[PDB]
Design a protein around this ligand. Sequence first.
Ligand SMILES: [Zn+2]
Ligand SMILES: [Zn+2]
Length: 76
Amino acid sequence: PKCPKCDKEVYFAERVTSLGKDWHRPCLKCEKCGKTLTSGGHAEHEGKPYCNHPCYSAMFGPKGFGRGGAESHTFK
Ligand SMILES: [Zn+2]
Ligand SMILES: [Zn+2]
C-alpha cells in the first residue's frame, strides 16, 4: 500500500487502487487538465496518473506528422 504518485504510504480509507498498487484519494489526478480522477476512468504514466482520454492518448501515445503548437498548446 504505497503511492506511485507522491511516494508516501497509503492509509486504508485514504486509498484507491490502480495497476494493482494503491494510491491516495486526492492524488489520483490528471497532470494535464487537473481533474480529480474516478473509479476506472484514469490511466497511469510513469509516476503520474491522468485521464484515460484524451490526455493519456494525447501526451503518451503515438501521433501524426509533427504539427505541435507554437507556444500555447492545443488539440495536437
Ligand atoms: Zn499520494
Ligand atoms: Zn485530463
